[PDB]
Design a protein around this nucleic acid. Structure first.
Lengths: 73, 50, 105, 93
RNA sequence: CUGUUGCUUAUAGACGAUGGCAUCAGAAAUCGGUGUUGUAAGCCUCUCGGGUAUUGAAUG
RNA sequence: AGGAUUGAAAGGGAAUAAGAUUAAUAGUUCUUAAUCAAGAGAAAUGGUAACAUAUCAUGAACUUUAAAAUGGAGUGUGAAAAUCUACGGAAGAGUUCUCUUUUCUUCUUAACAAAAGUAAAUUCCACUGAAAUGAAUCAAUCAGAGAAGUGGAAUUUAUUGGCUUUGUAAGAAAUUCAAUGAAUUGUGGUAUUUUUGCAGUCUUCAUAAAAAUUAAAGGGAAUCUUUUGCUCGUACUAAUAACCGCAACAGGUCUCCAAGAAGCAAAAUCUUUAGUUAAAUAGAAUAACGCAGGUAAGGGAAGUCGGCAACAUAGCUCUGUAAGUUAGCAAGAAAGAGUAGCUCUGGUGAUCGAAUCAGAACUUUAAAGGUUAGGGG
């Protein structure tokens, strides 16, 4: 597992076709966008709800998205 | 031991297979004298020496 | 305290059977397997440990980057800077001495 | 600090007064059971709270003296003090 | 008549034996006498207190 | 091109972890997340320097170097874990007519990677040139073939880069509550032990493996995605019942992990987690003679081949300690005094804390002695 640091690199990950799945985990303070790629699982810790919504919109519609909360699937 | 050669394990399995008694149907054959297998052994009674 | 067991079937505390007991989830402790401590590179002349090269197992040098297993200098990774500096002065001063002593003195 | 005791199903067993006093002459504000001038117990109708600010007290402190009650009045076998996970305690059978 | 059995029986005893009683029998606590230790627990004083006491001790 | 085979389930060695799961297997299954190997899709910069740059930035024959790969003792010290403890609590449990803001339990997190913040030790580099000699360590040791100072580079510290922190990752797990759903999961310590490194010191008429295999150098010849990963072992005991002694034999048989009290101590003794209450049958009675463990008036080796056996001395502190001697010892010689409980005071540090030492009142059954623990000449 690797972590992307700022908002720019994460977008290029969803823009690229290498993506396989996306899981969004909402915590009591932040929300993590975990992009399941071929080799690694990249994650972005978004602490701003406004920028979280922007990242949710940028997800391609043909990919599976899992929304996680206090209860795991 | 846990660690053993492949052919040694198969000889251990054969000794397990041969440690069995005469089946019931065999004992009902006419003119039958084989009721108990005398080549039988147990781990705590006779060591098979291999 | 929590007592542990070996995971592999090596029952003796040899050099390759080093372990570390670390804490895991729920309070139980698991057994790791720790690497052996390795030496570094030495200068071929003075036998001093070379700088800029990590002390890892021989097969792990292949995994490193190209620049991480040498020094960007002549005889880098086999001779110290003091080892090299004397090689340069030996080469130039002996040849210069031969030029004047012999070779049309 | 404001912790309450919920007695919505044991008012017949415990009348809220006594309990309103119990605390008053029993918190050891500085080792003295009774000198709770800074503790605001009041009545709070069905519930009983302490809403104390000046004095030092804790939730486990409150559960301790609550258990002193049901043992003192021999009814600890019937009830059992459980925290409501909301800085308060409620009694269960 | 004697033996068994009961009193987890004693003046007896390895087991037998021996001795005693067997319904006015026996057993039991309790109380009193008699001893040992040393002054209980709650609040120097309560306090010569408290505790034990046949188990092979003596009354009722 | 240089010498063939075999020889280690404790030597060398490419690469996997956490949680869950089974009546029984699990670094092997399942979930999630990784790693390794073998495949497929006229040749760069920076820094004075030590040296540094998500592959970068070519590098053949040949040669060289390094690694794999090297005793032991003792001292100091970095980090982790366990134990103990300070602050702040959340949840549950125990005691409670006598008190106890109380006692106890949980408050966790892997492989592999990241790089907010920040260490200890060592070795090098640049400036300058030290005598009125300085620098420093528990000890040492070091310096014009260049100290100290200032500023830098590198490496080691149980994976990346040692520690906190981060991704994995809370969605797991732990502890609770309700009838699957909800709650929590701070911060510290100039304390002890174990483990793991490090640094110098000492010691040898002892100097304490090799190869597979890997990297670098000198030389200058030539011009991200994806696939596969074969064979065999893997159950169980490992011993007061699974092994060797004819046996469920008080004998023998190599290792790993390791809590509290008390103490110098991994001693004896008691307890926690775990295991067990069965381990060649018992009941009544309470003779002799036994086996094991004790005690004893007065005397004190008179017993006996012989102090055999038993008794006796015993920890710590202070005072003191002879002849002899290979001058090192004898020596814990011998001999003497002290030691408890409670209430205080003082000494030993850092910018709150350590158990240790000394002294003073008062009280008592006058104190190492429960266990452990030299008899001496």
């Amino acid at each position: 597992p690797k972590q992307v640091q700022e908002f720019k690199q994460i977008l290029k990950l969803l823009k690229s076709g290498s993506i396989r799945a996306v899981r969004v985990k909402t915590n009591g303070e932040n929300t993590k966008f975990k992009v399941r790629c071929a080799k690694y699982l990249y994650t972005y810790i978004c602490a701003d709800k406004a920028k979280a919504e922007e990242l949710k919109k940028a997800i391609p519609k043909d990919i599976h998205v899992v929304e996680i909360a206090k209860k795991a699937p | 031991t846990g660690h053993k050669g492949f052919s040694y394990k198969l000889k251990l399995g054969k000794k397990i297979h041969q440690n069995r008694g005469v089946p019931q149907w065999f004992r009902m054959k006419t003119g039958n004298t084989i009721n108990y297998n005398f080549k039988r052994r147990h781990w705590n009674r006779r060591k098979m020496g291999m | 305290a929590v007592r542990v067991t070996y995971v592999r079937k090596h029952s003796y505390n040899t050099k390759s059977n080093g372990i570390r007991i670390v804490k895991t989830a729920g309070g139980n402790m698991t057994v790791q397997h720790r690497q052996k401590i390795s030496n570094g590179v030495r200068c071929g002349d003075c036998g001093c440990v070379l700088a800029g090269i990590r002390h890892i197992r021989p097969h792990q040098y292949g995994w490193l980057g190209k620049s991480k297993r040498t020094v960007t200098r002549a005889y880098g990774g086999v001779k110290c800077h003091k080892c090299v500096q004397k090689k340069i002065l030996r080469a130039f001063l002996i040849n210069e001495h031969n030029l004047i002593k012999l070779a049309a003195a | 600090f404001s912790c309450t005791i919920d007695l919505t199903n044991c008012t017949d067993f415990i009348e809220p007064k006594k309990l309103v006093t119990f605390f008053r002459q029993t918190i050891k504000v500085q080792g003295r059971a009774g000198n709770t001038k800074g503790i605001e117990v009041k009545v709070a109708d069905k519930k009983v709270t302490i809403t104390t600010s000046s004095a030092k007290l804790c939730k486990r402190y409150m559960k301790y003296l609550m258990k002193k009650y049901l043992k003192k009045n021999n009814l600890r076998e019937w009830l059992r003090v459980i925290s409501d996970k909301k800085d308060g305690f409620e009694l269960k059978f």
